[PDB]
Design an enzyme around this catalytic site. Structure first.
Site, mmCIF file in Angstrom:
data_model
loop_
_atom_site.group_PDB
_atom_site.id
_atom_site.type_symbol
_atom_site.label_atom_id
_atom_site.label_comp_id
_atom_site.label_asym_id
_atom_site.label_seq_id
_atom_site.Cartn_x
_atom_site.Cartn_y
_atom_site.Cartn_z
ATOM 1 C CG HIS A 39 -1.587 1.285 1.478
ATOM 2 N ND1 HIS A 39 -2.522 1.898 0.634
ATOM 3 C CD2 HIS A 39 -1.486 2.064 2.564
ATOM 4 C CE1 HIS A 39 -2.926 3.015 1.193
ATOM 5 N NE2 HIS A 39 -2.291 3.154 2.367
ATOM 6 C CG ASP A 98 11.120 18.064 -24.789
ATOM 7 O OD1 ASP A 98 11.547 17.334 -23.843
ATOM 8 O OD2 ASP A 98 10.069 17.827 -25.413
ATOM 9 C CD1 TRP A 126 6.363 3.109 5.243
ATOM 10 C CD2 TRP A 126 7.592 3.989 3.585
ATOM 11 N NE1 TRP A 126 6.677 4.409 5.567
ATOM 12 C CE2 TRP A 126 7.431 4.964 4.568
ATOM 13 C CE3 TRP A 126 8.344 4.301 2.451
ATOM 14 C CZ2 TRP A 126 7.971 6.241 4.443
ATOM 15 C CZ3 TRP A 126 8.861 5.563 2.317
ATOM 16 C CH2 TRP A 126 8.680 6.521 3.310
ATOM 17 C CB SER A 136 12.953 6.297 -12.137
ATOM 18 O OG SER A 136 11.997 7.117 -12.762
ATOM 19 C CB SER A 137 13.336 9.694 -8.417
ATOM 20 O OG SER A 137 11.933 9.451 -8.509
ATOM 21 C CG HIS A 166 11.785 14.683 7.420
ATOM 22 N ND1 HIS A 166 10.556 14.588 8.034
ATOM 23 C CD2 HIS A 166 11.741 15.815 6.714
ATOM 24 C CE1 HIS A 166 9.887 15.685 7.808
ATOM 25 N NE2 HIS A 166 10.555 16.428 6.953
ATOM 26 C CD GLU A 224 9.857 10.084 -1.152
ATOM 27 O OE1 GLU A 224 8.793 9.798 -1.785
ATOM 28 O OE2 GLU A 224 10.896 10.434 -1.715
ATOM 29 C CE1 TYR A 247 8.277 19.009 5.513
ATOM 30 C CE2 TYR A 247 9.899 17.298 6.027
ATOM 31 C CZ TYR A 247 8.908 18.188 6.440
ATOM 32 O OH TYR A 247 8.540 18.279 7.771
ATOM 33 C CB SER A 267 1.253 28.641 -5.309
ATOM 34 O OG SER A 267 1.732 28.532 -3.960
ATOM 35 C CG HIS A 295 11.024 13.873 13.259
ATOM 36 N ND1 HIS A 295 11.152 15.133 12.686
ATOM 37 C CD2 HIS A 295 10.511 13.066 12.310
ATOM 38 C CE1 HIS A 295 10.778 15.070 11.417
ATOM 39 N NE2 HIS A 295 10.372 13.822 11.170
ATOM 40 C CG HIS A 296 10.903 9.480 11.086
ATOM 41 N ND1 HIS A 296 9.531 9.339 10.820
ATOM 42 C CD2 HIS A 296 11.307 10.602 10.448
ATOM 43 C CE1 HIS A 296 9.164 10.316 10.012
ATOM 44 N NE2 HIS A 296 10.227 11.115 9.794
ATOM 45 C CB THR A 334 4.833 25.000 6.941
ATOM 46 O OG1 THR A 334 6.029 24.233 6.810
ATOM 47 C CG2 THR A 334 3.707 24.319 6.199
ATOM 48 C CE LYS A 388 4.757 26.950 -0.182
ATOM 49 N NZ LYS A 388 5.083 28.175 -0.927
ATOM 50 N NE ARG A 422 2.721 3.298 11.498
ATOM 51 C CZ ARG A 422 3.681 3.926 10.848
ATOM 52 N NH1 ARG A 422 4.372 4.890 11.445
ATOM 53 N NH2 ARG A 422 3.893 3.653 9.581
#
Ligand SMILES: CCCCCCCCCCCCCCCCCC(=O)OC[C@H](COP(=O)([O-])OCC(O)COP(=O)([O-])OC[C@@H](COC(=O)CCCCCCCCCCCCCCCCC)OC(=O)CCCCCCCCCCCCCCCCC)OC(=O)CCCCCCCCCCCCCCCCC
Ligand SMILES: CCCCCCCCCCCCCCCCCC(=O)OC[C@H](COP(=O)([O-])OCC(O)COP(=O)([O-])OC[C@@H](COC(=O)CCCCCCCCCCCCCCCCC)OC(=O)CCCCCCCCCCCCCCCCC)OC(=O)CCCCCCCCCCCCCCCCC
Ligand SMILES: CCCCCCCCCCCCCCCCCC(=O)OC[C@H](COP(=O)([O-])OCC(O)COP(=O)([O-])OC[C@@H](COC(=O)CCCCCCCCCCCCCCCCC)OC(=O)CCCCCCCCCCCCCCCCC)OC(=O)CCCCCCCCCCCCCCCCC
Ligand code: HEA
Ligand code: HEA
Ligand SMILES: CCCCC/C=C\C/C=C/C/C=C\C/C=C\CCCC(=O)O[C@H](COC(=O)CCCCCCCCCCCCCCCCC)COP(=O)(O)OCCN
Ligand SMILES: CCCCCC/C=C\CCCCCCCCCC(=O)O[C@H](COC(=O)CCCCCCCCCCCCCCC)COP(=O)(O)OC[C@@H](O)CO
Ligand SMILES: CCCCCCCCCCO[C@@H]1O[C@H](CO)[C@@H](O[C@H]2O[C@H](CO)[C@@H](O)[C@H](O)[C@H]2O)[C@H](O)[C@H]1O
Ligand SMILES: CCCCCCCCCCO[C@@H]1O[C@H](CO)[C@@H](O[C@H]2O[C@H](CO)[C@@H](O)[C@H](O)[C@H]2O)[C@H](O)[C@H]1O
Ligand SMILES: CCCCCCCCCCCCCCCCCCCC
Ligand SMILES: CCCCCCCCCCCCCCCCCCCC
Ligand code: CUA
Ligand SMILES: [O-][O-]
Ligand SMILES: [Cu+2]
Ligand code: NA
Ligand SMILES: [Xe]
Ligand SMILES: [Xe]
Ligand SMILES: [Xe]
Ligand SMILES: [Zn+2]
Lengths: 75, 258, 44, 227, 513, 91, 72, 56, 40
Positions: free
Chosen positions: E61, E91, E126, E156-157, E240, E242, E244, E255, E290-291, E316, E319, E438
């Site tokens: 998932h 392009d 995950w 890829s990324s 972390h 990731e 963001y 925006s 923090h994880h 944040t 924004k 969890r």
């Protein structure tokens, strides 16, 4: 003696080295006292502390390795 | 068109590359678990064919067709810098693993670094020779670059040949030191950190040596002008990256870690 | 290449009923797959 | 333990859990107020036919929007870090107990004086006694003296686990090759429940923790009887 | 012709179209997985099996929703379609490498689906923590196929990030500075820098896991002097950033949508929006632990990670306030895209605030590995990232296709999805505060009411997903061709018509100094 | 010590066209930002094109972050809809 | 210039490589291998290697790399 | 070696509508066919291997 | 936005067919698996 007191050398959540250091200290003391045929009663504090803190399986594994000649710490 | 950018002909190499990645990964799985190298050998073959044809086409587009305007060249400069940055962060992960394990040696190791029962290599013998070799190759590649800018074909070729010979010397010395090492990749976290970090570095040396050899043949065929030679610049930047990673490995793993 | 609405896509929208079938198979196959993988794991 | 339709934390059994409840009340008021203000301002921006679509100057308003949040964060951080350092404070425990995580059960070792250890497994649903709790009861509870500072050391003999007792404010990961410390002090007798809190395979859902908090003299006799 | 166009593409629009089709298919997979989770939890007891099958579903998932739905749609799809058009570029910098970023994803997905088909699957989470993910507790090919899936998605990324940074730096009109590019273009450049720096560290860590599993290394194995906690640091140093990466392109689309449907020529406080995204990107690299508040790190380390994490609320908030200030004074058009964007502002704010609760290590002791964390991240992902994707999809579908949606159907879709996601996730706060862990296939009886309601919410979300497929069909079925689009003076991507020609900006824009 | 070709000798295709145009101070491939005129109806910005329309972006004031985009058509000068700056197509 | 970098190549860099080659040369030759001790943190085997008999490392040197059971 | 770049520029600029990966001549078509045949064949083989590995 | 009238209008009946077919394509295969779980 109730349990192992706070030790300023090991003040954090990870107590692994506290168990390890006291197991080493007991066995070093025991070797030093038996070599001269001195008295292992002087080693008693380290024995009580490592027995209080160390998981049974860790002690059992370390004892097996000392007998095997595969214990990697210096005694 | 009245802009300076390159509209690339529709190409099959992205798809052959993507499928080569599927064949290599499924091939490694088949090798680790199903005792078979066949998929992996197909994937390595299609990967090498893809790389060959793709970079052949970049040479066709640039040297033979003239699509590499200054704007295109500036883009390639950024792309190669960004690629090198990603490779730096990849090595950062291995240095983190090394410092994590060596700064806080666990009881299983004897609570010391190096671990009980590990006999490190003498950093003043072959590791120091490897250091002199890669540093020397950083000097010779700089000679090659200046010869090319000054229009000197013979000295470019001699300097680049020296650079490649040193890269090969480093690779042969490292192969010999792997064979001679009394510790292995299975010798706990010492072996793990030593072989994976130096091993990825050795792979990068082989890649960079290959890139230099491509530049050597392109130079023999007169592809480079005294002002236009991005493949050579990119190979030189990659080669300096390989040098610098070696110096960090030398100081960290071979010297401080001994 | 063909330009314009319905031509800049890898699937035909010439016939809305053929398109419904193609979309049904496309989205349906993605939604179905996890159920069939669970069935596969349960049947071992 | 949790009760049906529960909205918030289990009632505090330890002083630090009390502190966490009061800190959460303060933080939740802020979450409510900011969420509410954002919803209200959305509704205010969207409920007028009056318009102003020319360029608007930003710098004055950006001072308010950085300073006021900075002040709010400091007002959260101050009590947050006071509690963080209170839990970490030197307390002098009377007792050390070890717990080892396993797939899928906890073992306990009380080795200050004698070699006491045992395994603690979930009661199967089909073997529950009338009135007992599904997925929460164990065969052998972790008997402990009430109103006493206890050092709990946590490790694993296989994969990661995590030793948790929500009503005491406790959660310590169980990592093989590592001995993690926490302190436990119950203000009250009774039964306090927790559940394994790191994914550990097939029966992660089914390896609970039950503490039984009793007077020292009962704990001593129980200890002797479990050798 | 078909093969040349769709398998051999060097065109940013057609590659963007491939990414949107891929991401749409992935979304159906991830939705089916989410319904299997909620079916298992929707009544007390066991439905499917023990925690292994359950956590294979949970693990798949997450990977599908993150790597095959959100990233391909936001970066591959919207980024490829919009970035070149928004800077007048003909392009991407590397149009052929761009096509390889796309074609790596079907193989990546194939390796993930193989992981679930062989042995007992990868029931690891995950995060793929050892030793559960190691060769003793997960023997056989499943975890290696998961690692290789991540390797191909990461290549890829990384190559996509190199492409976007180069395009955005090098291919603007010569008069256009970085401070004259639209906010969506900024959002993609910053996301691309995060990918470039973070994915190689994940690559190193999962490679170490692969060698621990297959070459007898011991990076994470205490028997060899390794440490399971080292894996967690390497993973979260990526993980972390990731999150963001998952939200920043959403912020960029929000925006544009808020500006457009407020009838404004520009967002409020442009330079503050740039500052906020760069600040979030930077701070996103210094907060990972923090994880790890329950792993046993030192108190001063916990104090630092608490404080640094809370700092992210300041940029944040600029924004969120700047979006509100963009609405202020607007001629508001209550389009379906605007509804998605307004839902985003509110629900993202709620999830960001429960993140600030979790940033407090002392309270995180009790909330860690509970449904409170699950409620936090589904507010920001299933109501933030997803609402930005849906708002951008309904806003730009007419640009991409040349056809209009039925706005009434799209409003119905929004209303159903809004009810379903809130019914699903709001009650999970209560389950977390009250201690539900969890990655559980079953729960003590006390947790039944909120699990029942949460599962009912998931079925309402399913109904919304099914309706979305019908709504796309109805648009292509009816063929309402776009005529006029408002505000083209401040939305360059629309100025070449709907859809734009295969080649745009063959003659570049004229911009003087 | 010679034998390396120069760009003058060996550059080809678009690279060579750019190189030769730059020697003549010409910019057919739009590498340079054009310099504004006063932009009045008497002195419009002259916008080259190879066709009968081209997109203009107008940065109306220095350091504006908002660019104003519009099609400029062959014929009478058109004005930026934000600042009124005049542009004239020169096909 | 090219002349200066050639001067550095032949005048400093290659002499350095020659001196380090000499140094390594003089310190080559086998040292006596240490007593085998079956330490549990070394010769790790959690899964057989995917080549050979599963128990030999990839660049196994019988002279200096003992197996888990000792020297061959 | 002699500088034959001008002869390759003429070959690769010939107005024959070929994409760059085939513009060298008949050898390009052969190497393309080998590459795509190994890729597609290998991919079908990888799917067979998944089928096999999906059952005990 | 403005747009032309539909080139191929989709009547209410045609919409009911598309919506029905779409929903069934999701619901029948999953429903078949879940109905048969005990059997598995
Ligand atoms: C690992 C693989 C990684 C990929 C490397 C990328 C290379 C990209 C270069 C490229 O594709 O251009 C070739 C390409 C061939 O020419 P072309 O465009 O095909 O044809 C017309 C040209 O314009 C021709 O103009 P020209 O100026 O290029 O002249 C080239 C050629 C003119 O001939 C032709 O190219 C066409 C004539 C038809 C005959 C075709 C014969 C080539 C067969 C190709 C097979 C390669 C497959 C590779 C994969 C193997 C997997 C099984 O003339 C020759 O006399 C040379 C013969 C062919 C050269 C290529 C030989 C390949 C060797 C193996 C490579 C992989 C290793 O030439 C260029 O465009 C550049 C040529 C110079 C570079 C080649 C140097 C290769 C370096 C080998 C690396 C070895 C590493 C050693 C390890 C040690 C480490 C410690
Ligand atoms: C685990 C894997 C991961 C799966 C991920 C799936 C996602 C992949 C995304 C990429 C999509 C594929 C496109 C490239 C390859 C397609 C090959 C092919 O034949 O496709 C035919 C098919 C279209 O058929 P058509 O209508 O007959 O073709 C019109 C052509 O102009 C007429 O062309 P022609 O006459 O020259 O030749 C067409 C002919 C033959 O054309 C050729 O010559 C091509 C031959 C080689 C094709 C190789 C490509 C393989 C596909 C890649 C994925 C694997 O094709 C056919 O009619 C039969 C082909 C049958 C194979 C279909 C495979 C498609 C993907 C299947 C989904 C995955 C199912 C797995 C099951 C899982 C259960 C465990 O293309 C598609 O697959 C398109 C998807 C279906 C339509 C859904 C539309 C939904 C709209 C959503 C909205 C989002 C967009 C918003 C903006 C839009 C405005 C811009
Ligand atoms: C579309 C939606 C479709 C369906 C959505 C799902 C339905 C949820 C139904 C919840 C009803 C609860 C219930 O059983 O009501 C009886 C419940 C019984 O009251 P009680 O037993 O005296 O509880 C007082 C607690 O002790 C008070 O102390 P506690 O410690 O027991 O309280 C903790 C509790 C307290 O939280 C709540 O009660 C949440 C109320 C949510 C309102 C929306 O939990 C939380 O902290 C929740 C965290 C939420 C995160 C932030 C949410 C931002 C709000 C957005 C503001 C916009 C407002 C306009 O009545 C209430 O107080 C309702 C609340
Ligand atoms: C899009 C994805 C996304 C985003 C953007 C975030 C954003 C944030 N996250 Fe979250 N998070 C996740 C996805 C995300 N997270 C995921 C997936 C996990 C679980 C990983 C796993 O274990 O599987 C997780 C877990 C996670 C944890 C670990 C909890 C645990 O496992 O015990 C923490 C800890 O601090 C955290 C905090 C935050 C914070 C502080 C932000 C901040 O960026 C939020 C900032 C926003 C606001 C604060 C709202 C707007 C601001 C205002 C209106 C101004 C005024 C506000 C104040 C004064 C407070 N999150
Ligand atoms: C993007 C990320 C994302 C999204 C969107 C979701 C969406 C949902 N998630 Fe999940 N979830 C995670 C990421 C996500 N999740 C992660 C990271 C975990 C932790 C895994 C772990 O513990 O290891 C997790 C865990 C998790 C759990 C906890 C499992 C456990 O601890 O045992 C639950 C429980 O209810 C849940 C449910 C759902 C539900 C019901 C939805 C529903 O809201 C989904 C509804 C459907 C959609 C939102 C549509 C999706 C499709 C599109 C948008 C396609 C669009 C098409 C076009 C644009 C053309 N997920
Ligand atoms: C001069 C040195 C050059 C190195 C060339 C050697 C081998 C080929 C592979 C090279 C790639 C580099 C690293 C891969 C991992 C391990 C190899 C480390 C280097 C090495 O070669 O290590 C050897 C072990 O090799 C082994 O296990 C061999 C294992 C072979 C299979 C490798 C598995 C590949 C792993 C997957 C790579 C993932 C890539 C990630 C990409 C990221 C995308 C985002 C050491 O030999 P030993 O007998 O243990 O000790 C010596 C005793 N006399
Ligand atoms: C045994 C080992 C096997 C493993 C596989 C990898 C092995 C080998 C790969 C070696 C890399 C060779 C790259 C050759 C590139 C040739 C094309 C080239 O260099 O193209 C140049 C452009 O650069 C460009 O594209 C620059 C292109 C840069 C690409 C460099 C990439 C390094 C690749 C690393 C890939 C794997 C790394 C992963 C490790 C974890 C062309 O422009 P110019 O030079 O200016 O010419 C034009 C003038 O003539 C005009 O007057
Ligand atoms: C362009 C198209 C792509 C080409 C596709 C080619 C497919 C042909 C693969 C051949 O199949 C092989 O069968 C062998 C045996 O039948 C296997 O041997 C292995 O398995 C044997 C078990 O019998 C053992 O001897 C060893 O593990 C080992 O030899 C091996 O794994 C497998 O690959
Ligand atoms: C999370 C997504 C899923 C949500 C729920 C889906 C809603 C269900 C849709 C209908 O699904 C069908 O239900 C039938 C029963 O109503 C099943 O027939 C089964 O039951 C019938 C009645 O006993 C028999 O006649 C059939 O043979 C037998 O297959 C049939 O197979 C199945 O396709
Ligand atoms: C002088 C032009 C290029 C110089 C690059 C830096 C020199 C590196 C030398 C390595 C030692
Ligand atoms: C002009 C280029 C702008 C790129 C901005 C990138 C901002 C993100 C910062 C991430 C740095 C993390 C360092 C660790
Ligand atoms: Cu033990 Cu989860
Ligand atoms: O990740 O927050
Ligand atoms: Cu985080
Ligand atoms: Na269940
Ligand atoms: Xe908060
Ligand atoms: Xe993935
Ligand atoms: Xe990766
Ligand atoms: Zn203007």
């Amino acid at each position: 003696y109730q349990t192992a007191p706070f030790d300023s050398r090991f003040p954090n959540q990870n107590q692994t080295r506290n168990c390890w250091q006291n197991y080493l200290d007991f066995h070093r003391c025991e070797k030093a006292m038996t070599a001269k045929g001195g008295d292992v009663s002087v080693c008693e504090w380290y024995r009580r502390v490592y027995k209080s803190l160390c998981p049974i399986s860790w002690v059992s594994t370390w004892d097996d390795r000392r007998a095997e000649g595969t214990f990697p710490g210096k005694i | 068109q009245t802009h300076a950018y390159h509209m690339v002909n529709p190409s099959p190499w992205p798809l052959t590359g993507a499928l080569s990645a599927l064949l290599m990964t499924s091939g490694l799985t088949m090798w680790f678990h199903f005792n078979s190298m066949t998929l992996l050998m197909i994937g390595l073959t299609t990967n090498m064919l893809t790389m060959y044809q793709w970079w052949r086409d970049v040479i066709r587009e640039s040297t033979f067709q003239g699509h590499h305007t200054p704007a295109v060249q500036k883009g390639l400069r950024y792309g190669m810098i960004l690629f090198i940055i990603s490779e730096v962060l990849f090595f950062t992960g291995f240095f983190w693993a090394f410092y994590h394990s060596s700064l806080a040696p666990t009881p299983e190791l004897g609570g010391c670094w190096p671990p009980t029962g590990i006999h490190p290599l003498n950093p003043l013998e072959v590791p120091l020779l490897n250091t002199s070799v890669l540093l020397a190759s950083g000097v010779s590649i700089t000679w090659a670059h200046h010869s090319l800018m000054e229009g000197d074909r013979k000295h470019m070729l001699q300097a680049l040949f020296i650079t490649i010979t040193l890269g090969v010397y480093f690779t042969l010395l490292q192969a010999s030191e792997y064979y001679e090492a009394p510790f292995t990749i299975s010798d706990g976290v010492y072996g793990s950190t030593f072989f994976v970090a130096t091993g990825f570095h050795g792979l990068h040396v082989i890649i960079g040596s290959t890139f230099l050899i491509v530049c050597f043949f392109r130079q023999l065929k007169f592809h480079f002008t005294s002002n236009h030679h991005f493949g050579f610049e990119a190979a030189a930047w990659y080669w300096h990256f390989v040098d610098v990673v070696w110096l960090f490995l030398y100081v960290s793993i071979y010297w401080w870690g001994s | 290449y063909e330009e314009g609405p319905g031509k800049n896509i890898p699937f035909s929208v010439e016939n809305k009923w053929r398109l419904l079938a193609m979309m049904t198979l496309f989205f349906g196959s993605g939604f179905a797959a996890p159920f069939f993988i669970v069935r596969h794991q349960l049947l071992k | 333990m949790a009760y049906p339709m529960q909205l918030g934390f289990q009632d505090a059994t330890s002083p630090i859990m009390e502190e966490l409840l009061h800190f959460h009340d303060h933080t939740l008021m802020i979450v409510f107020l900011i969420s509410s203000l954002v919803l209200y301002i959305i509704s205010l921006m969207l409920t007028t036919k009056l318009t102003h679509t020319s360029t608007m100057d930003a710098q004055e308003v950006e001072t308010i929007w950085t300073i006021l949040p900075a002040i709010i964060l400091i007002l959260i951080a101050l009590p947050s870090l006071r509690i963080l350092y209170m839990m970490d404070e030197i307390n002098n425990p009377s007792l050390t107990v070890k717990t080892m995580g396993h797939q899928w059960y906890w073992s306990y070792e009380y080795t200050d004086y004698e070699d006491l250890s045992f395994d603690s497994y979930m009661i199967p649903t089909s073997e529950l006694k009338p009135g007992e709790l599904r997925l929460l009861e164990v065969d052998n509870r972790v008997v402990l003296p009430m109103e006493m500072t206890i050092r709990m050391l946590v490790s694993s003999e296989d994969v990661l686990h995590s030793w948790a007792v929500p009503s005491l404010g406790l959660k310590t990961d169980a990592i093989p090759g590592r001995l993690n410390q926490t302190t436990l002090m119950s203000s009250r007798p009774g039964l306090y429940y927790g559940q394994c809190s790191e994914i550990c395979g097939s029966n992660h859902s089914f390896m609970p923790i039950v503490l039984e908090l009793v007077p020292l003299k009962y704990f001593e006799k129980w200890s002797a009887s479990m050798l | 012709m078909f093969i040349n166009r769709w398998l051999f593409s060097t065109n940013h629009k057609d590659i963007g179209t491939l990414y949107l089709l891929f991401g749409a298919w992935a979304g159906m997979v991830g939705t089916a997985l989410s319904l299997l989770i909620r079916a298992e939890l929707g009544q007390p007891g066991t439905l499917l099996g023990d925690d292994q099958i359950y956590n294979v579903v949970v693990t798949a998932h997450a990977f599908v929703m993150i790597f095959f739905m959100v990233m391909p749609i936001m970066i591959g799809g919207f980024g490829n379609w919009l970035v070149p058009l928004m800077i007048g570029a003909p392009d991407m910098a590397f149009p052929r490498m761009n096509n390889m970023s796309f074609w790596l994803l079907p193989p990546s997905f194939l390796l993930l689906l193989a992981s679930s088909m062989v042995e007992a699957g990868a029931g690891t989470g995950w995060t793929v923590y050892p030793p559960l993910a190691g060769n003793l507790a997960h023997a056989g090919a499943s975890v290696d196929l998961t690692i290789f899936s991540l390797h191909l998605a990461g290549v890829s990324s990384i190559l996509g990030a190199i492409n976007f940074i180069t395009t955005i730096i090098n291919m603007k009109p010569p008069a256009m500075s970085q401070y004259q590019t639209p906010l969506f273009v900024w959002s993609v450049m910053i996301t691309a820098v995060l990918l470039l720096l973070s994915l190689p560290v994940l690559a190193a860590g999962i490679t170490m896991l692969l060698t621990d599993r297959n070459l007898n290394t011991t990076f994470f194995d205490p028997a060899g002097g390794g440490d399971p906690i080292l894996y967690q640091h390497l993973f979260w140093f990526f993980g972390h950033p990731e999150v963001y990466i998952l939200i920043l392109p959403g912020f960029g689309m929000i925006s544009h949508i808020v500006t457009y449907y407020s009838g404004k020529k520009e967002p409020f406080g442009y330079m503050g929006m740039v500052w906020a995204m760069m600040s979030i990107g930077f701070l996103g690299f210094i907060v990972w632990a923090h994880h790890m508040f329950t792993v046993g790190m030192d108190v001063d380390t916990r104090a630092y990670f608490t404080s640094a994490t809370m700092i992210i609320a300041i940029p944040t908030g600029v924004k969120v306030f700047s979006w509100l200030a963009t609405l202020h004074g607007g001629n508001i058009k209550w389009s379906p895209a605007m509804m998605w964007a307004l839902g985003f502002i509110f629900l993202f704010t709620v999830g960001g605030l429960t993140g600030i609760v979790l940033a407090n290590s002392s309270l995180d002791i009790v909330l860690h590995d509970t449904y409170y964390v699950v409620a936090h991240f589904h507010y920001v992902l299933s109501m933030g990232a997803v609402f930005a994707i849906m708002g951008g999809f309904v806003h730009w579908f007419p640009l991409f296709s040349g056809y209009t949606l039925n706005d009434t159907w799209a409003k119905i879709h929004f209303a159903i999805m809004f009810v379903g996601v809130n019914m699903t996730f709001f009650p999970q706060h209560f389950l977390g505060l009250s201690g539900m862990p969890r990655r559980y296939s079953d729960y003590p009886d006390a947790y039944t009411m909120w699990n029942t309601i949460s599962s009912m919410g998931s079925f309402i979300s399913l109904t919304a997903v099914m309706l979305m497929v019908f709504i796309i069909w109805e648009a292509f079925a009816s063929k309402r061709e776009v005529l006029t689009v408002d505000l083209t003076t401040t939305n360059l991507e629309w100025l070449n018509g709907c859809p734009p020609p295969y080649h745009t900006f063959e003659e570049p824009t004229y911009v003087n100094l | 010590g010679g034998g390396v070709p120069t760009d003058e000798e060996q550059a080809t295709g678009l690279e060579r066209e750019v190189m030769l145009a730059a020697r003549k101070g010409q910019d057919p491939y739009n590498i340079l930002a054009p310099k504004a005129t006063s932009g009045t109806k008497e002195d419009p910005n002259l916008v080259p094109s190879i066709t009968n329309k081209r997109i203009v972006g107008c940065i109306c004031e220095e350091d504006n972050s908002t660019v104003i985009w519009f099609w400029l058509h062959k014929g009478e000068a058109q004005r930026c809809p934000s600042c009124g700056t005049h542009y004239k197509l020169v096909p | 210039g090219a002349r200066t970098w050639r001067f550095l190549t032949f005048g400093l860099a290659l002499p350095s490589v020659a001196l380090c080659t000499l140094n390594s040369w003089l310190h080559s030759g086998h040292r006596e291998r240490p007593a085998f001790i079956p330490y549990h943190h070394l010769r790790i085997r959690t899964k057989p290697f995917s080549w050979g008999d599963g128990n030999h490392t990839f660049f196994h040197n019988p002279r200096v790399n003992p197996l888990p059971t000792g020297y061959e | 070696f002699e500088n034959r770049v001008a002869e390759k520029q003429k070959l690769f600029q010939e107005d024959n509508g070929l994409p760059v990966h085939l513009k060298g001549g008949a050898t390009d078509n052969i190497l393309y066919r080998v590459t795509m045949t190994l890729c597609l064949g290998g991919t079908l083989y990888s799917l067979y291997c998944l089928g096999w590995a999906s059952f005990p | 936005i403005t747009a032309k009238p539909a080139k191929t209008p989709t009547s209410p009946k045609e919409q009911a067919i598309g919506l029905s077919v779409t929903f069934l394509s999701f619901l029948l295969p999953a429903g078949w698996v879940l109905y048969h779980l005990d059997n598995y």
